[PDB]
Amino acid sequence: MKTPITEAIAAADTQGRFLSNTELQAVNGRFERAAASMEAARALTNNAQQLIDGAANAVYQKFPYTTQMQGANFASDSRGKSKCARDIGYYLRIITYSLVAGGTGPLDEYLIAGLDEINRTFDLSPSWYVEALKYIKANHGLSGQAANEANTYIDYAINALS
Amino acid sequence: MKTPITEAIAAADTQGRFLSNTELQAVNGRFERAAASMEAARALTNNAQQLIDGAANAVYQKFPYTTQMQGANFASDSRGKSKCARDIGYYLRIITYSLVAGGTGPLDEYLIAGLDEINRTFDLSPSWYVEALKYIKANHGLSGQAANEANTYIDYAINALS
Amino acid sequence: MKTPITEAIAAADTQGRFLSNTELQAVNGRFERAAASMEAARALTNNAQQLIDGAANAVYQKFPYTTQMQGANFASDSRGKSKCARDIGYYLRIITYSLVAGGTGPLDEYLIAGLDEINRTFDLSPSWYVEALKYIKANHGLSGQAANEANTYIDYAINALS
Amino acid sequence: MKTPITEAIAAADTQGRFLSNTELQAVNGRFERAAASMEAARALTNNAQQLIDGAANAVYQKFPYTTQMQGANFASDSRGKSKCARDIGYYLRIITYSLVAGGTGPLDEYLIAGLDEINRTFDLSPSWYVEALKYIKANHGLSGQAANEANTYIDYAINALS
Amino acid sequence: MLDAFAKVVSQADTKGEFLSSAQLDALSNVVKDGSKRLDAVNRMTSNASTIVANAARSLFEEQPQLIQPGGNAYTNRRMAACLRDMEIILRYVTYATLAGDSSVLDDRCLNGLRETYQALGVPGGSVAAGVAKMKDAAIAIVNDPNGITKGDCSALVSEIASYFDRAAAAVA
Amino acid sequence: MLDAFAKVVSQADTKGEFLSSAQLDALSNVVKDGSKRLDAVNRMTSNASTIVANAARSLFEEQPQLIQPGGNAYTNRRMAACLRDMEIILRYVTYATLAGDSSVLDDRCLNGLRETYQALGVPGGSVAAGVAKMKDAAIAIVNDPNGITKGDCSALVSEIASYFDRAAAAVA
Amino acid sequence: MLDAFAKVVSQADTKGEFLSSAQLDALSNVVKDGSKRLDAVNRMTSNASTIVANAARSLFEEQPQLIQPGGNAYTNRRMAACLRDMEIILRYVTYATLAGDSSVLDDRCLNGLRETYQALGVPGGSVAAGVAKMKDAAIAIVNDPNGITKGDCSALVSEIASYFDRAAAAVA
Amino acid sequence: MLDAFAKVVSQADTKGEFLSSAQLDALSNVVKDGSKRLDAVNRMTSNASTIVANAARSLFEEQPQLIQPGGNAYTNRRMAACLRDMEIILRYVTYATLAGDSSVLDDRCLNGLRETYQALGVPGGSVAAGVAKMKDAAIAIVNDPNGITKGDCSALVSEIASYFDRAAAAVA
Ligand SMILES: *[C@@H](C)[C@H]1/C(=C/c2[nH]c(/C=C3N=C(/C=C4\NC(=O)C(CC)=C4C)C(C)=C\3CCC(=O)O)c(CCC(=O)O)c2C)NC(=O)[C@@H]1C
Ligand SMILES: *[C@@H](C)[C@H]1/C(=C/c2[nH]c(/C=C3N=C(/C=C4\NC(=O)C(CC)=C4C)C(C)=C\3CCC(=O)O)c(CCC(=O)O)c2C)NC(=O)[C@@H]1C
Ligand SMILES: *[C@@H](C)[C@H]1/C(=C/c2[nH]c(/C=C3N=C(/C=C4\NC(=O)C(CC)=C4C)C(C)=C\3CCC(=O)O)c(CCC(=O)O)c2C)NC(=O)[C@@H]1C
Ligand SMILES: *[C@@H](C)[C@H]1/C(=C/c2[nH]c(/C=C3N=C(/C=C4\NC(=O)C(CC)=C4C)C(C)=C\3CCC(=O)O)c(CCC(=O)O)c2C)NC(=O)[C@@H]1C
Ligand SMILES: *[C@@H](C)[C@H]1/C(=C/c2[nH]c(/C=C3N=C(/C=C4\NC(=O)C(CC)=C4C)C(C)=C\3CCC(=O)O)c(CCC(=O)O)c2C)NC(=O)[C@@H]1C
Ligand SMILES: *[C@@H](C)[C@H]1/C(=C/c2[nH]c(/C=C3N=C(/C=C4\NC(=O)C(CC)=C4C)C(C)=C\3CCC(=O)O)c(CCC(=O)O)c2C)NC(=O)[C@@H]1C
Ligand SMILES: *[C@H](C)[C@H]1/C(=C/c2[nH]c(/C=C3N=C(/C=C4\NC(=O)C(CC)=C4C)C(C)=C\3CCC(=O)O)c(CCC(=O)O)c2C)NC(=O)[C@@H]1C
Ligand SMILES: *[C@H](C)[C@H]1/C(=C/c2[nH]c(/C=C3N=C(/C=C4\NC(=O)C(CC)=C4C)C(C)=C\3CCC(=O)O)c(CCC(=O)O)c2C)NC(=O)[C@@H]1C
Ligand SMILES: CCC1=C(C)/C(=C/C2=NC(=C\c3[nH]c(/C=C4\NC(=O)[C@H](C)[C@H]4CC)c(C)c3CCC(=O)O)/C(CCC(=O)O)=C2C)NC1=O
Ligand SMILES: CCC1=C(C)/C(=C/C2=NC(=C\c3[nH]c(/C=C4\NC(=O)[C@H](C)[C@H]4CC)c(C)c3CCC(=O)O)/C(CCC(=O)O)=C2C)NC1=O
Ligand SMILES: CCC1=C(C)/C(=C/C2=NC(=C\c3[nH]c(/C=C4\NC(=O)[C@H](C)[C@H]4CC)c(C)c3CCC(=O)O)/C(CCC(=O)O)=C2C)NC1=O
Ligand SMILES: CCC1=C(C)/C(=C/C2=NC(=C\c3[nH]c(/C=C4\NC(=O)[C@H](C)[C@H]4CC)c(C)c3CCC(=O)O)/C(CCC(=O)O)=C2C)NC1=O
């Protein structure tokens, strides 16, 4: 996995040397930000079901037709709503993965890769998930740097869908 | 020049992209360590003359022949004493450069390059300067991470001579 | 092994020819100088222990701290002094090897290769061994061309440490 | 040009370094052999005319048809005798060049190159000149290593014709 | 390339003297405001598309022939190329902002840009106008006091605006 | 390779689970001990020469046949190669310490190493003894209470000892 | 390249005549002094660093702006380059000394050197001064009567000084 | 490869010993016989043609089927190849003689040679006989007391005979 620590170590190893003072400063920066990172991850993991259901409802209100039109790709019945909550949970879970790891590695490998083909095949509009992420961003309740970390990784998720 | 900030910027520019959160974390590590780095630079610059003279006298006390034997490469007379003080001043000046820059760049560029041939040609033993830097390390009056930074770059100079 | 004779033979063999008059003249030069070479080697091998102990004592007087400071790399006890005499004996033995062979081959392969890492790792200052070699050079008691041969190979040893 | 001294210097210059002790030994071999080489050169130059005339007469005595058969390539008349004396003079002159230079360089460069086509075109048998050089070898009046050197380069000329 | 520390160290090495207390104080102030600097860089990069959009909207409002038939930004090709240009220039400005020095922006982005644009027929004056509007949008976003700790970022804003005007003057 | 966070995240992804409060708290403890972890890594790299020296000294005292004629570390070439191996294993231990996971040590250093030594004729047991003595010297340098804010580093020390023992068990 | 023997042989081959007794006598004297010549070459190469150091010390004493800020030999880079230059020129002088002919020094070292130095901004006059000081130091070391057999080396010293002045005149 | 000095030095290095007075005196004897050794090498190379000729003559008298139709040395190609092999073995013997050690002869000539001959169909026993006859001719040329300062060369002669017998035993 790509993490700041693993990248530092791989840079040291390519040149066959010990870790320099610069790489130690970089890993120190990762550790310093990791307090906010883990705070945001713990918050998003505790409020998991609340945020998932709130984001699903946000998508439903913002796009009313997803609760009305018949079709397997919409959420007009219980199966669709379960699938939609499950998808939003996937997104949020991998975002917590990234927050824990400290980089976009988990999002790049576990979510974004192949996402466009999944969405095109099953006719899932990316703007639905953009709205879900926007709700999660506006309602995690975090403040300060934990909020900023959660926001950067949610935004990274948003840019993949855009 | 090779600073952590310039290295992060060059990494981002090679991939023709904006700065990533990993790189911003690394630059923040540099900024958080820069407080101690700048305190150490300020201290070593303010007490520059005391440190230079004390290091020269430590070298003399440890290797007494340098004050006794005749020959241009020794400190038996005033010209030799002044040349040695100038040399230790060059070492300390460039170490403060490196503390300011936050990396080994200035030490790699302004001191260590060609140092071996310089010392071989004028018959200057590297162990003299090793002892001078050991004195400077033992007498800079810094405590904590400022002392840790000063000793990091002083030991970097020591290993370039060994 | 690289010797003048082996180099002559390898030059003859690369071109698939017999030895030319020029190569015979070169090998004659080696043989002519080999009288002084073997004289110096025999002298340095007979006076082995005397020269080893004298050089150790020269290093101790020139660098008094090596008999006072505690530490495994110094000679403040019996173990350190035994190790130091052993090292100086290694140097002198390989120098006699070179004198016998007629070239720097033995010094390059049996001593100099890896010497810098050995000295850096165990904190053995090369200037100690430079002083030991200087004593051996000033006190072999040889005269004329045997002295000159011993001096060239001792100096070659000195340059490796510088 | 290709002399032992120039070859040693070129070897040192290819590696961008000062001259080594091996190369100085080889150049000393050249200098020690140069006494005999110069004695042989001096002798062959002083007795040049006697040696040339004696060699021509030896060729005539061994191959009598060269004095009897008509044709421009023979020595039946005065023009042929003079051409043959001039040729043997060229051979001896260049052999003295080689003794002076200390290598086969002048013989390789001034005589042997193109010699085969010259002799083929003007129908000159190489065995004539072989016999002339055998006479010169048998009648130079040198003893010891000067004779050894003279015979070395004369046999070198002999093998270029065989 | 150079950052602030590297520029000062180069100028001190070329004179052969220690850093004066003035230079030490200036670089220590840079260190103290480092968190504000990271905030500026983060806000400018994570809002880059919004900055480009605002600048382009203003530029096309006051120079509408740009998006009209025959205009130098009419077709999808030329529109996307103009947006790429503005995002490139903003990216190099964020580089200079992180470095605290304009050397990267001058050497890797601005040097020779006016010649490129005039060889391409791209009107450099309107490019400079778009850069100035990028400056306005970026400074608006950076100075936004919501979601952040209250503090004075006037020096940083002035430095960023100096970078933006340096970019606009290199093609105007 | 993996660090601690990456290992936990990979195991979570395989099960399709959010991290449990166990894993969250463990990684939070890693984050709060990060400064001491950096201290351990810095102290091991800055004194790598002395660690190798003390370990090799103790080993050669214990097994003097190693540095006598015929020994496997007798000539200058063999001695320098042995010290090189010592510093290599130490460097990968420092990697694992910074990462908080032994993946880099196993994959990039320990794997196939016993076979390499048995093919070269190097006594793997002696290498393991030297690795243990490196462990002792490195722990002595890490726990040295001078010049450092006093605290408990026993968890990091046990982790580092585990990395060293893993390295030693891979060649014995 | 040429040595003394080769130069004489080339000039005699171009005229097509045997060596006169004068040329034979000159080359035989070269052979007789060959051991002195080897002594000069050996002393100049094995004391090369001392020769360069003495010359540089004198040169910087009389032209101190060379080692002062802004001087052409101030920084570690330019200092090491100046020392490399002096060691190179001394090496080619030792080549010519072993050859007994300046052809190698002219063709491989001096030809085009003034153009190089003036294109680089290296002051050729001070280079020539440093070469002359190298000459003084080298001749001092060669003529040292200790550790050697007493004898006249005035001709050899004059030849070496001619090489040194040829080098100094090629850049002055 | 090795010469005598190199073999003694390698064996000394393996044991970590100074040379014993035995080895010192042996190598001093080599040095004092150096002139006669050079004489042997020069006499063998300068008369390599006659050595090969005498050996081949004696061999072809002894084994006339070699140079009759169907013989293994009958055609011009086979004859020239046989003389080439003779001169090759002689050249490597001269190498070994100059070196005072047979290493070059074994490693660069004798190794795998019996297999090469048995694969080519060349009678190895006949090659060995020719090598012995080369030995006889070469010793006759070396011990010829004319034109040389009289002395004892019996040690060198036995050494050269040992090299020749080693060459012969490698193909029979
Ligand atoms: C909007 C800002 C204005 C404008 C823009 C426009 N630009 C181009 C084409 C090019 N732009 C560049 C610029 C750069 N390339 C780099 O690598 C860098 C920095 C390192 C810069 C600053 C270049 C090189 C080109 C030509 C090659 C290319 O297109 O990639 C165009 C396209 C012009 C055309 O297609 O003919 C346009 C339209 N257009 C406007 O109307 C605005 C004034
Ligand atoms: C002017 C632009 C506005 C302003 C700036 C400002 N920022 C801070 C304090 C902090 N900013 C950060 C952000 C980061 N730290 C990092 O390492 C990284 C890289 C990932 C980032 C993006 C942090 C962590 C802090 C400290 C924590 C905190 O909440 O304070 C301040 C506070 C003063 C200071 O310098 O510490 C200020 C003033 N604030 C405004 O109101 C301006 C509009
Ligand atoms: C265990 C090895 C010993 C120990 C550790 C210890 N250290 C600290 C406090 C700090 N350590 C650092 C280290 C770094 N910051 C960096 O950026 C880098 C790389 C360039 C390093 C190596 C820092 C900054 C601090 C805070 C300032 C300070 O000096 O206190 C502590 C206390 C704080 C904490 O644990 O979080 C401890 C316990 N102390 C011992 O007694 C052990 C022998
Ligand atoms: C001290 C003697 C003076 C001086 C020296 C100086 N020289 C250079 C840089 C160069 N020197 C050379 C010379 C040679 N290269 C060769 O191969 C040979 C012979 C075969 C010679 C004579 C060259 C080619 C260069 C340029 C390339 C390089 O550096 O290798 C410098 C460096 C100049 C710079 O860095 O800008 C210096 C300083 N400086 C003084 O102050 C003395 C007057
Ligand atoms: C003028 C430079 C000083 C001087 C020269 C001088 N040298 C010798 C004699 C010898 N010099 C050597 C040195 C070597 N011979 C070699 O083959 C090699 C290459 C490895 C070297 C370095 C030798 C061997 C001799 C002969 C032995 C001896 O000790 O004499 C002399 C003696 C006269 C002569 O030409 O033979 C002289 C005069 N002596 C001085 O006093 C000048 C200061
Ligand atoms: C044994 C083969 C026969 C023999 C040998 C012998 N030779 C000499 C004396 C000298 N031999 C040389 C030879 C060379 N010097 C070189 O530089 C070269 C290569 C270019 C060679 C081949 C020299 C210079 C001498 C000294 C001058 C002289 O002619 O005497 C000796 C006597 C001296 C000694 O042994 O050291 C001997 C015994 N003599 C025989 O009777 C053997 C048949
Ligand atoms: C909710 C925002 C809207 C929506 C939801 C919805 N999704 C699906 C079916 C699928 N969703 C996925 C997505 C993923 N699977 C993965 O492994 C990953 C990476 C972590 C992702 C992003 C997939 C693959 C499917 C199809 C296969 C499956 O069921 O797992 C559906 C069902 C559509 C169907 O045809 O079955 C629905 C309804 N629809 C809405 O109206 C919501 C607004
Ligand atoms: C004496 C000049 C000073 C000194 C001596 C000293 N040396 C050592 C330990 C070692 N010395 C070596 C050197 C070599 N071993 C080789 O094989 C070769 C090539 C021939 C060399 C040059 C090595 C490898 C060691 C360490 C392993 C060993 O003991 O063999 C010590 C002991 C240091 C230690 O930590 O054990 C000492 C004391 N110290 C002084 O103060 C003298 C002035
Ligand atoms: C920053 C890059 C740089 C370095 C490193 C440097 C070092 C340096 N020190 C020198 C001289 C010297 N250095 C010393 C110092 C010493 N002798 C003793 O006995 C003392 C123990 C010891 C002090 C530690 C002395 C005595 C000299 C004069 C030697 C001479 O003039 O030959 C010289 C010869 C030229 C000169 O006089 O300036 C150089 C180049 N110059 C540079 O530009
Ligand atoms: C150094 C390089 C060199 C060589 C080698 C050389 C040889 C040489 N000898 C020639 C003629 C000759 N050489 C001879 C000599 C001989 N005929 C006999 O019967 C004698 C036995 C024998 C003497 C050994 C004769 C007779 C000629 C004249 C043949 C003719 O004119 O066709 C010619 C024809 C051109 C001329 O007349 O000069 C050449 C080129 N010239 C050179 O520049
Ligand atoms: C990145 C991972 C990596 C590892 C792990 C590594 C180890 C390694 N050590 C080697 C040699 C060696 N290793 C040793 C070490 C020892 N001898 C002793 O007596 C001691 C027990 C011990 C020192 C503690 C020696 C002596 C050799 C040379 C073997 C020989 O030359 O015969 C070799 C092959 C020959 C060589 O390179 O010199 C390898 C590949 N190289 C790598 O790239
Ligand atoms: C540097 C080491 C080296 C060696 C030793 C060597 C020997 C050698 N001799 C060969 C052939 C040969 N060698 C001989 C020699 C002999 N026939 C007889 O009747 C005699 C007993 C004897 C002569 C004394 C012959 C006849 C051939 C050619 C075989 C054929 O064409 O059928 C060949 C292969 C074919 C060829 O090259 O022509 C080799 C490799 N080449 C090398 O490079």
Author numbering:
A (entry chain C), B (entry chain A), C (entry chain C), D (entry chain A): 1 to 162
E (entry chain B), F (entry chain D), G (entry chain B), H (entry chain D): 1 to 172
Describing publication, verbatim:
X-ray crystallographic analyses and EM analyses of CPCs have revealed that the quaternary structure of CPC is a closed toroidal (αβ)6 hexamer with D3 symmetry that is thought to be formed by assembling two trimers face-to-face. In the present study, the native CPC from O-77, namely TlCPC, was isolated and its oligomeric states were determined using X-ray crystallographic and cryo-EM analyses. These structural analyses unexpectedly revealed the coexistence of conventional hexameric (αβ)6 (TlCPC-6) and novel octameric (αβ)8 (TlCPC-8) states, even though TlCPC-6 and TlCPC-8 possessed the same amino acid sequences; notably, PBPs with C4 or D4 symmetries have not previously been reported.
This crystal model contained a dimer (αβ)2 in the asymmetric unit and consisted of eight (αβ) monomers to give an extended closed toroidal structure with D4 symmetry. The dihedral angle of the (αβ) monomer (αGln70–αArg30–βGly70) in TlCPC-6 was approximately 110°, whereas the equivalent angle in TlCPC-8 was approximately 123°. In the crystal of TlCPC-8, two octameric (αβ)8 units were stacked along the C4 axis to form a double-layered orientationally aligned structure of [(αβ)8]2, which were further assembled at right angles to each other. In TlCPC-8, the distances of intraprotein PCB pairs were as follows: α84PCB–β82PCB (20.7 Å), β153PCB–β153PCB (21.7 Å), and α84PCB–α84PCB (31.6 Å). These values were similar to those in TlCPC-6, whereas the distance of interprotein PCB pairs of β82PCB–β82PCB (31.7 Å) was increased relative to the equivalent distance in TlCPC-6 (26.2 Å) because a contact area was not observed between octamers by the PISA program, presumably due to the demand for octamers to fit the unique crystal packing of TlCPC-8.
